[PDB]
Amino acid sequence: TPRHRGIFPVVPTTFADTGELDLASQKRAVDFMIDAGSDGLCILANFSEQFAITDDERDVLTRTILEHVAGRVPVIVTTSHYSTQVCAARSLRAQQLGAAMVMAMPPYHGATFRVPEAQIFEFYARVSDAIAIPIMVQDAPASGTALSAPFLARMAREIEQVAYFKIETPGAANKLRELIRLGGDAIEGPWDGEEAITLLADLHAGATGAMTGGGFPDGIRPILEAWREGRHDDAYARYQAWLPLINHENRQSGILTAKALMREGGVIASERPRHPMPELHPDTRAELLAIARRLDPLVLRWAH
Amino acid sequence: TPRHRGIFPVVPTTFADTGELDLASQKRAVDFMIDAGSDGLCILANFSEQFAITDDERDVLTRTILEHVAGRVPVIVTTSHYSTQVCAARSLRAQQLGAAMVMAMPPYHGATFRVPEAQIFEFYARVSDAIAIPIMVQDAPASGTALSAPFLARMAREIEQVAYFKIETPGAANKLRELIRLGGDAIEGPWDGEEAITLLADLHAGATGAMTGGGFPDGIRPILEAWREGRHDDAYARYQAWLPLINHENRQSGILTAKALMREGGVIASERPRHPMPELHPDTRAELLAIARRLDPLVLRWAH
Amino acid sequence: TPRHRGIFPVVPTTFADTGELDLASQKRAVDFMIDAGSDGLCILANFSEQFAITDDERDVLTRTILEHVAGRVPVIVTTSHYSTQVCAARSLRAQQLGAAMVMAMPPYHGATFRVPEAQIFEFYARVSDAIAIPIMVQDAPASGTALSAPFLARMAREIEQVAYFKIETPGAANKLRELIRLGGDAIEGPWDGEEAITLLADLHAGATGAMTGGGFPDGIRPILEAWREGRHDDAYARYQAWLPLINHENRQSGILTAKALMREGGVIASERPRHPMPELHPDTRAELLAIARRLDPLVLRWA
Amino acid sequence: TPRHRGIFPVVPTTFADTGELDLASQKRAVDFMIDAGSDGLCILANFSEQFAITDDERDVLTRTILEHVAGRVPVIVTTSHYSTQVCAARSLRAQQLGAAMVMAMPPYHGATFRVPEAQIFEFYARVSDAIAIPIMVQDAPASGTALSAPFLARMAREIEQVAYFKIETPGAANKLRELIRLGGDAIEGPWDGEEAITLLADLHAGATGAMTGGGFPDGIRPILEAWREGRHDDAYARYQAWLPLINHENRQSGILTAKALMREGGVIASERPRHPMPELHPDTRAELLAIARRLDPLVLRWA
Known part of the structure; x- marks a missing residue:
């Protein structure tokens, strides 16, 4: 019934050691993530370090990734901007390059620039x-x-293209419950995020998709498959086995988790963030790999 | 001693009602602000709605304004970006177009992406x-x-180009006092902002420059002139006369103040912000103009 | 129509230099504030350093101040607490001690403990x-x-005792406009706060009362009187003359403004806050007194 | 060398159906938590719903719990208050009633009242x-x-009684590493919190104690025992087994987790929070118990 469901991991942005885009590593990261079983990909999100790149780089990356994916899986392009017209233009450009969907935060800037509900509605309506x-x-x-559940549901009901939701605020499961109740069939994609840290609770609440980190979608996807098939005990067992790694990503290694795994695995040339984002503490990285090696994820045995 | 002192108002970004850049009104606003007596200008700051424009637009505005100013006054170009390399590239481009100085927030994004002191220092050092x-x-x-006063003073002492400060956090006067005490001669420009709402206290604290709104630099500049000449009572009397307008800008009409005054005066064609930023409440606008008309500002009698 | 209007300044909590309550100074501060023309008083609010006192001190102060006022002016007692039952109990105690009104924040704690709208409604309904x-x-x-304007108006319409509002979030004037419109005759008291810094805009918006600092209600009250009488230009003139002092209180000397002035004038024995609230920077204090002397407020010539 | 180490779970505050304190259930919760093997107990913290109780209730709970513990395990009494002198008085009273340690947040109030580093130092120095x-x-x-790691280490080195830390801000493991590096043996207790969600990473970073929720200290404590004995694989296996329950507590059922489990097990009479704190969603509660029953915790087989 929904056009899209399942696991849509966030593609990290791969830089060279000196900060320029590394497009060769970017393509390998995409190929690994498709081989890991992703139902689709999300690009230029926060786990992609989108706040560290330019508009010109955003366009290069969108062109490069969509062309390299070559229709194998659907791609969600993140297009957030404070300006309605800028977001609409980015979204139309993404569509013309082959995007299956766009993702947008509500308009905001920094700590202090916020937008009332009425204008947020207009923002999404115009996009x-x-x-x-x-x-x-x-x-x-x-x-x-x-963004309250009633407001989110109203947007889904009243705005033609608003149909999917990445709910990652605290209490996401019970917000998903309310979103589904108020939105009905207009909620095509009640999805969660935050690296799948609350995936079990969110599946109980009715989530049908998960936007995870890019390092181990092969570890997480069978949870969603088991859940949809009614194999709830299998889903729990898989969640339990992978939760220490999900937790280390969520709390310790963060955005850089996927790149540290891909670099250790030979998928990408450099795991560096763009300065000034702090690099991983060497102990945090060592502990990451130690947990990962217990689980034998594809990322450490794909390039070899 | 310092290379720059005095009033450096923020140039608003002028749009058509449609949201496109209005570069004709943009140049008229610049000319008015220079005629009002500004010691320099600051572009692409928050009162310029910089969060609502694209990288391409940023370059168009920087080139257009610097060319139109044609060296009549120094221009500060705001170049903030999370990425060190992006900020450095923007700052070099601004320099190449004729900027006298760049202004940069510390690296940040949204409500949650923050950067430790050590990496903030490296950010400014590399720029x-x-x-x-x-x-x-x-x-x-x-x-x-x-950004604590000890940290800001350390950057002034240890980083060659860090020399000016726009202090507009709460308690700016006593932060300016401590910045000057700890930084000494390395504090070339202890300046304030926030539309001049705390100008009197900040002058007592040792501020030598003020980054105000663009609607009435002619009202504010004689306060700084009087202060520098030791005419403290003349400064106070002028501050008292203009404070209700400063206060209405700070608390009621905000970013759109300068544009509402400029539009009423025929300086610019349209006072609208870029959507989704809310437009001015009609009563807020009427009360703004009522206060301004008590003060005979140049913006309402600029015959060019 | 309304039971209460005008200026209701916040009474500071007067401590000895040692930190103990100084009730002798507390009573003098109250007497000065009444002599300054206050239409009423508000006690135990944030400008009263309510976060720095104990429950026992709250009760001592409520009893002492209400008895000393002796019905001369109405007193609003601030009773906020996270717990509905605790707030309701404090409010009933305040009523039994002679309060004309209670003021309560919505339930909250710290930076992170918040309460959904539905339970905030139940909180005020039960109080x-x-x-x-x-x-x-x-x-x-x-x-x-x-607390949106529609939610506040709904509480006024549906909860019997909810009838007054202290609006001091950013954009208070236009929130007051919407609250007054949506709430209609249930909005008995659309008031502002924040030391009167936005008072002119808030009066244009329909505010009928102002909860200010306690140092110079005599400076501010004629703005409200002029406004009520249709003397809008006189109101502007008074606002303009006093706005540098209002601005210094709002941005520089803050909560301690009233106490610094009262100590300078000999109204109270000590201007100190309770530790750890920072003391005034000496230049901030000197600048406060320099502005105040120019305006000749009652606090410097009362004692 | 440290005086205290290991697991110090937070004791929930048990209310009756009426919202009054239920001291009989309070004592049973203490007995269960001790029987579950707790090295010590922490009372009146935020997981104890301390923001919902009065000063009188705080004193009754401190007296009641310390007397009931009867020296069996050490008790940390949380004494946070904005006022230095109030916190010091609470802490001295806690000491006289037998507390082993006090815990205090830095002085704060609400969303907006904050204290500079210099006065935070003075606050702790005077307590x-x-x-x-x-x-x-x-x-x-x-x-x-x-509270930066350098500032925390400075307080530990310069203030006699500052010796223990509950680090539960984001990135606690890296912060604990830096605190230990900068403070040396002045850091007697580098501990973590947040229900043990980051316990494995925090143990790698040098944490010697954990302040957890009160529902299943028996599940968590073997992780700390294995770590201290160098059985790092055993610690991981136990952490992995219990992490789904820790995670549900941390993200879904929150403060009320321990009370829901204790009520289900017959330890306490009522699991309600004080109004207006939201009650547990029925699905959240059912899912909590489903996970818990996979792990056979003592709380469901105690009474």
Whole structure:
């Protein structure tokens, strides 16, 4: 019934050691993530370090990744901007390059620039008017913006392209419950995020998709498959086995988790963030790899 | 002693009602602000709605304004970006177009992405390494980032281009006092902002420059002139006369103040912000103009 | 129509230099504030350093101040607490001690403990059930809690004692406009706060009362009187003359403004806050007194 | 060398169906937590719903719990208050009633009242001067106050009783590493919190104690025992087994987790919070118990 479901991991942005885009590693990262079983990919999100790249780089990356994916899986392009017209233009460009969906935070800037509900509604309505592909509303702490379940459901019911949701604020499971109740069939994609840290609770609440980190979608996807098939005990057992790694990503190694794994595995040439984002503490990295090696993820045995 | 002192108002970004850049009104605003007596200008700051424009637009505005100013007054170009290399590249481009100085917030994104002191220091150090013009550190609530007076003084002493400071966090006067005490001659420009709302206290604290709104620099500049000449009572009397307008800008009409005054005066064609930023409440606008008309500001009698 | 209007300044809590309550100074501060023309008083609010005192001290101060006022002016007692039952009990105690009104923030704690709208409604509904005097809902940044104009108006319409509001979040004037419109005759008291810094805009918006600092209500009250009488230009003139002092209180000397002035004038024995609240920088204090002397407020010539 | 180490779970506050304190259930919860093997107990913290109780209730709970513990295990009494003198008085009273240690957040109030580093130092220095038992500094999001590792280490080196730390801000493991590096043997207790969600990473970083929720200390303590004995694989296996329950507590059922489990097990009479704190969603509670029953915790087979 929904056009999209399952696991849509966030593609990290691969830099060279000196900070320029490393497009050769970017393509390998994409190929690994498809081989790991991803149902689709999300690019230029926060786990992609989007705040560290330029508009020109955003376009190069969108072109490069969509062309390299070559229709194998659907791609969600994150297009957030404070300006309605800028977001609409980015979203139309992403559509013309082959995106299956765009994702946008509500408009915000920094710690203090926020937008009232009425204008947030207009923002998403005008982005929807400009495109013919679905919009995923991102509900995440980084925007510092409250998007209530009734407001989110109203957008799904009333705005043509608003149909998908990445719910990552605290209490996401019970918010997903309310979103589904109020939105009904207009909620095509009640999805969660935050590296799958709350995936078990969110599946109980009705989530049908998960936007995870890019390092081990092969570890997480069978949880969603087991859940959809009614194999709830198998889903729990898989969640339990992978939860220490999900937890280390969520709390310790963060955005850089996927790149540290891909570098250790020979998928990418450099795991560095763009300065000034702090590099991983060597103990945090060592502990990451120690947990990962217990689980034998594809990322450490793909390039070899 | 210092290379720059006095009033450096923020140039608003002028749009058509449609949201496109209005570069004709943009140049008229610049000419009015120079005619009002500004010692210099600051572009692409938060009162310029910089969060609502693209990289391409940033370059168009920088080139257009610097060319139109044509060396009549120094221009500070705001170049903030999370990425060190992006900020350095923007700052070099601003220099190449004729900027006297760049202003940069510390690296941040949204409500949740913050950078430790050690990496903030490296951020400014690397921007400094790239350019020949001075850096103004912006200390403002929008970044959600704490920059202590000891830390700011250390950057002034240890980083070649860090020499100017826009202090607009709460308690700016006593922060300016401590910055000057700890930094000495390395504090070339202890400046304030926030539309001049705390100008009197900040002058007592030793501020030598003020980054105000663009609607009435002619009202504010004689306060700084009087202060420098030791005419403290003339400064106070002028502050008292203009404080209700400063206060209405700070608390009621905000960013759109300068544009509402400029539109009423025929300086610019449209006072609208870029969507989704809310437009001015009609009563807020009417009360703004009522206060301004008590003060005979140049913006309402600029016959060019 | 309304039971209460005008200026209701916040009474500072007077401590000895040692930190103990100084009740002798507390009573003098109250007497000065009444002599300054206050239409009423508000006690135990944030400008009273309520976060620095104990429950026992709250009760001592409520009893002492209400007895000393002796019905001369109405007193709003601030009773905020996270717990509904504790707030309701404090409010009933305040009523029994002679309060004309209670003020309560929505329930909150610290930076992170917040309460959904539905339970905030139940909080105020249950406090209202316990008492027979009106409630003032405080809409202020300290709570970190969003109270929309429609929600506030719904509480006024549906909860018997909810009838007054202290609006001091950013954009208070236009929130007051919407609250007054949506709430209609249920909005008995649309008031502002924040030391009167936005008073002119808030009066344009329909505010009928102002909860200010306690140092110079005589400076501010004629703005409200002029406004009520239609003398809008006189109101502007008074606002303009006093705005540098209001601005210094709002941005520089803060909570300690009233006590610094009262100590300079000999009204109270000590201007000190309770530790760890920072003491005034000496230049901040000197600049405060320099502005104040120019305006000749009662506090410097009362004792 | 440290005086205290191991697992010190937070004791929930048990209310009756009426919202009054239920001291009979309170004592049973203490007995269960001791029977579960706790090395010590922490009372009146935020996981104890301390923001919902009165000063009188705080004193009754401190007396009741310390007397009931009867010296069986050491008790940390949380004494946070904005006022230095109030915190010091609470801490001295806790000491006189038998507390082994006090825990205090830095002084704060609400979303907006914060204290500069210099006055935070003075706050802890003066509390230390008042008492003869150690202080645990709580580094937690609820205070909205930044306490850098250099500042925490400085307090440990310069303030006699500051010796223990509950680090539960984001990135606690890296912060604990830096605190230990900078403070040396002045850091007697580098501990973590947040229900043990980051316990494995924090143990790698040098944590010697954990302040967890009160529902299943028996599940968590073997992780710390294995770590201290060098059985790092055993620690991982136990952490992995219990992490789904820790995670559900941390993200879904929160403060009420321990009370829901204790009520289900017959330890306490009522699991309600005080109004207006939201009650547990029925699905969240059912899912909590489903996970818990896979792990056979003592709380469901105690009474």
